[PDB]
Amino acid sequence: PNNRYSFIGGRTGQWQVVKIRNVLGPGLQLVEKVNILNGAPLDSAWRLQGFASNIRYAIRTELEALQAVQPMLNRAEAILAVLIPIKKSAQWWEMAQDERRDIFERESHHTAVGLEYLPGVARRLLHCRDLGEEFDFLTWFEFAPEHSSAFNELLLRMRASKEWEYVEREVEVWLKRL
Amino acid sequence: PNNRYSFIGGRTGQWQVVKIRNVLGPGLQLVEKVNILNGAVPLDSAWRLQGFASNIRYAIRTELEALQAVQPMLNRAEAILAVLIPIKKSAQWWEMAQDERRDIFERESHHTAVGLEYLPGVARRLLHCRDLGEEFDFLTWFEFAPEHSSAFNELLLRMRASKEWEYVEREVEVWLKRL
Ligand code: HEM
Ligand code: HEM
Ligand SMILES: [Cl-]
Numbered sequence: 001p002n003n004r005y006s007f008i009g010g011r012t013g014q015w016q017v018v019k020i021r022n023v024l025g026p027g028l029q030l031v032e033k034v035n036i037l038n039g040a041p042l043d044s045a046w047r048l049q050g051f052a053s054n055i056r057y058a059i060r061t062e063l064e065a066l067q068a069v070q071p072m073l074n075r076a077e078a079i080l081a082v083l084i085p086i087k088k089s090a091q092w093w094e095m096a097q098d099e100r101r102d103i104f105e106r107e108s109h110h111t112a113v114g115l116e117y118l119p120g121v122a123r124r125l126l127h128c129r130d131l132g133e134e135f136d137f138l139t140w141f142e143f144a145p146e147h148s149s150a151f152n153e154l155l156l157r158m159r160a161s162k163e164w165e166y167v168e169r170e171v172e173v174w175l176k177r178l
Numbered sequence: 179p180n181n182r183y184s185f186i187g188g189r190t191g192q193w194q195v196v197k198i199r200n201v202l203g204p205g206l207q208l209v210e211k212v213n214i215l216n217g218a219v220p221l222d223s224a225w226r227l228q229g230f231a232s233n234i235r236y237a238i239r240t241e242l243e244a245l246q247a248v249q250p251m252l253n254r255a256e257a258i259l260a261v262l263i264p265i266k267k268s269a270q271w272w273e274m275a276q277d278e279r280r281d282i283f284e285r286e287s288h289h290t291a292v293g294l295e296y297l298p299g300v301a302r303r304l305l306h307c308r309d310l311g312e313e314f315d316f317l318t319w320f321e322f323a324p325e326h327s328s329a330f331n332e333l334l335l336r337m338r339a340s341k342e343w344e345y346v347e348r349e350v351e352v353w354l355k356r357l
C-alpha cells in the first residue's frame with residue numbers, strides 16, 4: 001500500500017530531531033534523525049507506521065471550513081515539524097459512534113479550536129490501531145518557526161480537553177527539515 | 179495481529195463452497211473450499227482475501243444496545259451454512275463526510291433497523307479491508323441454520339434495493355457449508 005507511511009528513528013533521514021518530549025506514558029528513544037517512507041534497517045532505534053484513511057467524525061460544514069484555509073504540506077517556509085504519536089484508552093474504543101463524536105467535538109471543540117491555528121499549521125492524520133501498532137494515531141504538523149509559540153499553545157489547549165481524558169500515551173518529536 | 183483474518187479459496191479448509199454468485203462487477207474463481215486463518219498470509223489456492231476487525235463507525239449507543247440484546251454467537255451447532263460477501267463501495271462514497279455517510283447508511287437506508295429484523299436467525303461479522311489496499315472494502319460473514327436461507331435471501335434483496343447500495347460497485351456471494 002501507498003496509503004502506508006513509515007517513520008524510522010535513527011541515523012538517516014530528511015529530518016533532524018531537535019527534541020523529544022515524553023508527555024505521557026513510555027517515551028521513544030532519542031535518535032539523530034527520522035526517515036519517512038511511503039510503504040511498510042540497521043542503526044535505527046524504532047519504527048512507527050500508519051495509513052491514511054477516510055474521515056471518521058468531521059461533518060460536511062467542518063470539512064468545507066477546513067478546506068477553505070488549510071495549507072498544503074511541503075511549503076518552503078515550513079521548516080519545522082512535530083510528529084505526535086497518540087494512543088487512546090480501551091474505554092474510548094468501546095464507545096459508540098455518537099458518544100465519541102460528542103466528546104471529540106461537542107465537548108472538546110477539536111475542530112473549532114484547531115481551525116484557529118490555520119493556515120500557519122499544516123497537518124496530517126495517520127491511523128495505526130488497526131495494524132496492531134503500539135500507538136493508535138500518528139499526527140504530523142509542520143509550520144514556519146514564526147508559529148511555534150502558537151503551536152505550543154494549541155497543544156496546551158487540546159490537552160486540557162475532555163477528549164484528552166482518554167489519551168494514555170503521547171510523545172512529541174520535534175523536527176527540522178534538512 | 180489477532181484482529182486480522184485471511185480467507186483462502188482453494189482445495190483445503192473448514193468450509194465447503196456450495197456456490198459463488200457473481201452479483202456485481204468481476205467475480206471470484208470457483209473453488210472447492212475456503213480456509214479461514216487468524217493472521218495475515220497457498221499452493222493449490224486461487225484467491226486470498228483479508229480484513230481486520232475494527233471499532234464502530236456508524237452505530238449509535240441505542241442501536242448497539244438493541245443489537246447486543248439479540249445477536250447470536252458464532253459457531254452455534256445448528257449454524258451450518260455461511261455466506262461470505264465481499265463488497266467494494268465507490269470513490270464517491272469514501273469522499274463524503276461522516277454525517278453524509280451516516281445519513282445514507284441509516285436514515286435513508288435503515289441498514290441497522292432492517293438487519294435487526296433477521297436476528298437471531300443470522301449471526302454476523304464485519305471486517306474492513308480498504309485501508310489495507312485490498313481489492314474489496316469489506317468482508318461480511320453471515321452464518322445460520324438452513325431453516326433461515328429463505329429469510330437471509332429476502333434480507334439481501336431488501337438491502338440491495340436501498341440507497342446505500344447505489345454506492346456499491348463490486349459484490350460477490352460465496353455460499354458455504356461447514357465441514
Ligand atoms: C492544527 C489544527 C488541527 C486541526 C484543524 C485538527 C483537525 C482534526 C480533525 C478534523 C480530525 C478529524 C478527522 C476525521 O474526522 O477523521 C482530527 C483528528 C485527530 N486529531 Fe486533530 N486537529 C488539529 C490539531 C491536532 C493536534 C495539535 C493534535 C495532537 C496533539 C491532534 C490530534 C488528533 C487526533 C489524535 C485525531 C484522531 C482522533 C480520533 O479519531 O479519535 N489534532 N483533527
Ligand atoms: C443481517 C443483519 C445485519 C445487521 C444487524 C447489520 C448491522 C450492521 C451494522 C450495525 C453496521 C455498521 C457497523 C459500524 O458502525 O461500524 C453494518 C455495516 C455493514 N454491513 Fe451490515 N448488517 C446486517 C446485514 C448486512 C448484510 C446482509 C450485508 C451485505 C450484503 C451487510 C453489509 C454491510 C457493510 C458492507 C457494512 C459496512 C458499511 C460501511 O461501513 O460503509 N450488512 N451492518
Ligand atoms: Cl501488512
Ligand SMILES: [O-]
Nearest residue numbers: 123124125139
Ligand atoms: O489532526
Ligand SMILES: [O-]
Nearest residue numbers: 302303304318
Ligand atoms: O454487517
